[PDB]
Design a protein around this ligand. Structure first.
Ligand SMILES: O=P(O)(O)OC[C@H]1O[C@H](OP(=O)(O)OP(=O)(O)O)[C@H](O)[C@@H]1O
Ligand SMILES: O=P(O)(O)OC[C@H]1O[C@H](OP(=O)(O)OP(=O)(O)O)[C@H](O)[C@@H]1O
Ligand SMILES: O=C(O)c1cc(=O)[nH]c(=O)[nH]1
Ligand SMILES: O=C(O)c1cc(=O)[nH]c(=O)[nH]1
Ligand SMILES: [Mg+2]
Ligand SMILES: [Mg+2]
Lengths: 224, 224
């Protein structure tokens, strides 16, 4: 339960800008969650740079080799851009050829056409970047988009691993990130997990929100 | 005729990544154009960083004061993010507080909800960032989004002013940028104009491409 420097830095900022919030939220999966992590609150020049640094440190740590960083609409779009920039800035010589890409929700019926903006994906190694993983639906849809574009996914990175199951009916009790990793045979990286949030906020948190967090995790929390 | 250094550098950048395409393109306005400037081709970390620098210099030298840099979907999304970062990096204390924002095409039906990602627009001074202006429809629609959110548009910046009319029926034949600027009483900044890129390319434009561009501008080119 010991946090790394860049994780402590990231979580400190997440609290400051109110990216991490407690209440009542309908997730994309339709789950009623007592907390929500909104990366859209990292919205100053400094916070965006700090956010990009957090991802870049996690990516550098993994020693993963890739050509394009792909961010799915919508949260993934600014993420792909800022992290691509950051990796070329702090990568030294390893990420000097690094490219970015993202998708439109719908194919463009004029201009250059297509759904992919940025780098062409065919025959390139792709890192998928996103904000959070819950049930893993978004990443699976991103995988298909990339597969259809003839790119090869070599990994994924998220800011927050919510440590939830794909479905409550899954027998092994593997988290979404673990399921995706095993399913595609690729590393799934994260800056922090829910466990890091709980252990970091330990020094200054109720004790009433914890009740709702534990109640939510009995339903959706991974056990493996 | 006489280019500023940041313009020279940008034009070099545009040629480096070959952002200017030739062929037969249907524009968003439905115009059939012999050329197409695709900002999606600034697709490496270095290209994105240098692209952001071009926007940032132009913004800084305009002395415009604003709170949020807003980029319309889709091309404006990475632009708002990278230029927000860049301005905080090179702009000094006058730009340590600016925030970025962008829109989804459709309202989010869950989570944080809404159409705006990043900074809330209400009660803030907004600079709209986009890639190109042709007929000006995108910037008008961005203005409407911001105005309906009770934000205050204070200016706009694009990479390329295509120097075309809003409508062939407009009486003075002012360009789209000139029309938008007068209409809203706001500056409309552009890194470069069509005439800059054509002049810069010199003999690199073919006889076929030259003739097609002439024909296009006889129809759609501004005169004021
Ligand atoms: O693991 P999952 O269950 O798929 O949920 C996680 C996804 O949900 C959100 O996207 P969403 O489309 O809701 O929001 P956005 O429009 O802000 O990207 C989030 O950005 C993740 O991509
Ligand atoms: O001045 P106008 O006549 O409005 O044309 C310029 C706009 O057209 C393109 O957007 P589009 O929605 O076609 O493409 P995108 O989805 O790649 O942003 C371009 O990115 C500008 O925003
Ligand atoms: O599952 C989601 O929809 C979701 C959860 C979360 O914590 N943050 C987010 O942006 N989306
Ligand atoms: O008008 C357009 O659709 C358009 C023109 C252009 O040169 N580049 C672009 O991205 N869109
Ligand atoms: Mg998303
Ligand atoms: Mg656009």
């Amino acid at each position: 339960i010991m946090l790394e420097d860049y994780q402590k830095n990231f979580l400190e900022l997440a609290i400051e800008c109110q990216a991490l919030r407690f209440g009542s939220f309908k997730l994309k999966s339709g789950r009623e969650s007592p907390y929500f992590f909104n990366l859209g609150l990292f919205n100053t020049g400094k916070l965006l740079s700090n956010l990009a640094t957090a991802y870049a440190i996690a990516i550098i740590q993994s020693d993963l080799k890739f050509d394009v960083i792909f961010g799915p609409a919508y949260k993934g779009i600014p993420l792909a851009a800022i992290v691509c920039v950051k990796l070329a800035e702090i990568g030294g010589s390893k990420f000097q050829n690094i490219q970015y890409a993202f998708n439109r929700k719908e194919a463009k019926d004029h201009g250059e056409g297509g759904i992919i903006v940025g780098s062409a994906l065919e025959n390139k190694r792709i890192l998928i970047i996103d904000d959070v993983m819950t049930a893993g639906t978004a990443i699976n849809e991103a995988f298909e988009i990339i597969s259809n574009a003839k790119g090869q996914v070599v990994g994924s990175i998220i800011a927050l691993d919510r440590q939830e199951v794909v479905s409550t009916d899954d027998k092994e009790g593997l988290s979404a990130t673990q399921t995706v990793s095993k399913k595609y045979g690729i590393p799934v990286l994260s800056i922090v997990s829910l466990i890091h949030i709980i252990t970091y906020l330990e020094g200054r948190i109720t004790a009433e929100e914890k009740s709702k967090i534990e109640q939510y995790l009995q339903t959706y929390g991974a056990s493996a």
